[model samples]
Target: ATVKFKYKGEEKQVDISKIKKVWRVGKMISFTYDEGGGKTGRGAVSEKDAPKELLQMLEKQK
Candidate 1:
């Protein structure tokens, strides 16, 4: 499974298999993932969601 959203007008998506963690702080929904570069990468989408909904869905990617 996968998810998609727009961040600053740029479309982005990641497979559930790749998502590591999903969290929120202030007005951003953030996530971390391993794309296999010897390090974990992270991203965030600005305020548009109710926060909990998106966090729940992505965190469930486990």
Candidate 2:
């Protein structure tokens, strides 16, 4: 699955497959992104951090 959102005021796209884990128990999800680190950027998204529109899209995916 793919979700799109605005980051730093620019549209960005993320693939669900890039997600390392999803913790519904904690209402959080972690994902990885490449940014020249030769590694990945690990980010967590929770209700608190999630954008309302993005959250709605994720919910529909479920």
Candidate 3:
């Protein structure tokens, strides 16, 4: 599964399986994921902008 969203006018895609952690604060959903090369990627998107499937997946995070 993959999540696609536009942030700050830039479009991005992230693989759901690579997500290490995820959380929501109000309308914002944030997550951390492995980007390889010892890098951990982070991003946030408004709940309304995310797909329902992606939202559910993030909600299941610990």
The candidate that wins on TM-score is 3
Sorted on TM-score, best first, the list reads 3, 1, 2
Q: Of the candidates shown, which would achieve the greatest lDDT relative to the real structure?
A: 3
TM-score of 1: 0.55
Candidate with the larger TM-score of 2 and 3: 3
lDDT string, candidate 1, 1-62, tens digits: 66676668877777767878767777776789888877998876676643354556545875
Which segments of model 3 are wrong by more than 4 Å? Answer: 57-62
| Overall lDDT per candidate, in order of appearance | 0.69, 0.58, 0.78
Q: Quick one: ranking by lDDT, best first? A: 3, 1, 2
Q: Candidate 1: where are CA atoms >4 Å away?
A: 7-10, 49-53, 57-62
lDDT per residue as tens, model 3, 1-62: 78877778888888878888877878687888898798997888786787677665434874
Candidate with more favorable, higher lDDT: 1 or 2: 1
Judge candidate 3 at residue 47 and give its lDDT: 67
lDDT of 2 at 30: 57
lDDT head-to-head 1 vs 3, winner: 3
Task: In angstroms, give how far residue 33 of model 3 lies from its true place.
Answer: 1.2
lDDT of 2 by residue, 1-62 (tens): 66664557776777765655444446665556555547676555565766554456455877
lDDT of candidate 3 vs native? 0.78
